[PDB]
Each structure stands twice: as C-alpha cells, then as structure tokens.
C-alpha cells in the first residue's frame, strides 16, 4: 500500500541526515524502522535518551551530560526529540566531525538558552563531562585543566572574560577560530586521550 507510510522517513530529513553523517539512506531508513518500534510516536524522551548513554558507559555516569545534550537539541523544549535530532545528537558526542557545528557547541554551553554563555554554564557542562570519564582518565589531563573549576576558569580566561560577563555567540565563534587552544578546551573530548601534544 505504497503512497502511504506511517513508517516512511521523509526526503528532507533523509537529506539533512545524509549531509551531517556517514550513514547511507538505506542505513537511516533501516535504523528509523527499529527506532519506531521502541518509540511509536516517532519521538524519544529525555529519560530514554539518558538510558541509552547509561547503558553504554559501564564505569561512569553520563546521564547529566546526556541531559544537556538532549536539551541542546530540544528546540520547543518538549522533552522530546524526533528521529533526526536524536541521530544528530548521538553524533555530537563522538567527534566524527570537529569544529563540528560550532553551532551545537554554543547551544550546549548556553544552558539557560538565553543566547549567551556565562561562566556558571561553562562550569556546569564541564562538570557533566567529568562525570563521564574515569579518575584514571583525569590523571592524564594537564595539571591546570584537571578539575571542572580549573577548566572553566581557564576557558573563561581565554575568552578574556571577567567572572560576571556574558559571552555572545559571535565572541564564541571568533575565539574558537582565532585561538586553537580555545577550540581544544571547548570541545572537551579527550576521553582517556590527551591532545595539545
């Protein structure tokens, strides 16, 4: 009964996804079909998204991080993501694209969603990230970057901001482009590794 599919993806979505990922159309449609079986409305919740991460991080606690990630893609703030946003969200975590939408990195760090980043939002995200790595991974970080408080202080120092100043998106973009040290600090993802070599 073609011409009618409650299980059909969409050509706009399929395209956006093929652009931002390495998945083929056939791979996406097959994934979508299974996703519809556990999420029949075609939308996944905060709680289910967090459970995905909790199940694949045996030794750590990625829930707070997963919650921030979900929040950053939840436009209407429903507490739900459609297939496309859940697929892209799963991609933000593990690189697969660096300078990977500076757009997403900004949305993640603007916790309040007010349009700027404050130092408290920075600390909040960095704390969520530390909860997802192990004490052994932490032993591997630069001594001045090994705690949430230290990373956030340092990030704020590089963005040349005083403690009560807000960081705008234009500044975020300029900083990350102008100084490589800033980009590295921001896309904090040296999970057992350490770049900046």
Swiss-Prot record:
It comes from Homo sapiens (Human). Acts as a calcium sensor and regulates phototransduction of cone and rod photoreceptor cells. Modulates light sensitivity of cone photoreceptor in dark and dim conditions. In response to high Ca(2+) levels induced by low light levels, prolongs RHO/rhodopsin activation in rod photoreceptor cells by binding to and inhibiting GRK1-mediated phosphorylation of RHO/rhodopsin. Plays a role in scotopic vision/enhances vision in dim light by enhancing signal transfer between rod photoreceptors and rod bipolar cells. Keywords: Calcium, Cell projection, Disulfide bond, Lipoprotein, Membrane, Metal-binding, Myristate, Oxidation, Redox-active center, Repeat, Sensory transduction, Vision. EF-hand 2 and EF-hand 3 domains are the low-affinity and the high-affinity calcium binding sites, respectively. EF-hand 1 and EF-hand 4 domains do not bind calcium due to substitutions that disrupt their respective Ca(2+) binding loops. The cooperative binding of calcium to the EF-hand 2 domain following EF-hand 3 domain calcium binding requires myristoylation. Calcium binding to the 2 EF-hand domains induces exposure of the myristoyl group through a protein conformation change, this process known as the calcium-myristoyl switch facilitates binding to photoreceptor cell membranes. A lipid is attached at residue 2 (N-myristoyl glycine). The modification Cysteine sulfenic acid (-SOH) is found at residue 39. Homodimer; disulfide-linked. Homodimerization is caused by prolonged intense illumination. May form a complex composed of RHO, GRK1 and RCVRN in a Ca(2+)-dependent manner; RCVRN prevents the interaction between GRK1 and RHO. Interacts (via C-terminus) with GRK1 (via N-terminus); the interaction is Ca(2+)-dependent. Coiled coil: none annotated. Signal peptide: none annotated. Belongs to the recoverin family. Ca(2+) 2 binds at residues 110, 112, 114, 121. One of its GO terms (molecular function) is calcium sensitive guanylate cyclase activator activity. The keyword Repeat applies. The record marks 192 as: Interaction with GRK1. The N-terminal glycine is linked to one of four different types of acyl groups. The most abundant is myristoleate (14:1), but 14:0, 14:2, and 12:0 acyl residues are also present. The Ca(2+) induced exposure of the myristoyl group, known as the calcium-myristoyl switch, promotes RCVRN binding to the photoreceptor cell membranes only when intracellular Ca(2+) concentration is high. Oxidation on Cys-39 occurs in response to prolonged intense illumination and results in the formation of disulfide homodimers, and to a lesser extent disulfide-linked heterodimers. Residues 25-60, 61-96, 97-132, 147-182 form the EF-hand domain. Gene3D superfamilies: EF-hand. InterPro entries: EF-hand-dom_pair, EF_Hand_1_Ca_BS, EF_hand_dom, Recoverin. Residues 189-192 are annotated as: Interaction with GRK1. This is Recoverin. Retina and pineal gland. Ca(2+) binds at residue 116. GO terms for biological process: phototransduction; regulation of calcium ion transport; regulation of signal transduction; signal transduction; visual perception.
């Amino acid at each position: 009964m073609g011409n009618s599919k409650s299980g059909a993806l969409s050509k706009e979505i399929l395209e956006e996804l093929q652009l931002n990922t390495k998945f083929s159309e056939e791979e996406l449609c097959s994934w979508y079909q299974s996703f519809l079986k556990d999420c029949p409305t075609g939308r996944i919740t905060q709680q289910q998204f967090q459970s995905i991460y909790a199940k694949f991080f045996p030794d750590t606690d990625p829930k707070a991080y997963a919650q921030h990630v979900f929040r950053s893609f939840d436009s209407n703030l429903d507490g739900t993501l459609d297939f496309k946003e859940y697929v892209i969200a799963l991609h933000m975590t593990t690189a697969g694209k660096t300078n990977q939408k500076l757009e997403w990195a900004f949305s993640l760090y603007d916790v309040d969603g007010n349009g700027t980043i404050s130092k408290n939002e920075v600390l909040e995200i960095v704390m969520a990230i530390f909860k997802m790595i192990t004490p052994e991974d932490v032993k591997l970080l630069p001594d001045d970057e090994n705690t949430p408080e230290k990373r956030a202080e340092k990030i704020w120092k590089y963005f040349g901001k005083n403690d009560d100043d807000k960081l705008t998106e234009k500044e975020f973009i300029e900083g990350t482009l102008a100084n490589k040290e800033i980009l590295r600090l921001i896309q904090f993802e040296p999970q057992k590794v350490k770049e900046k070599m």
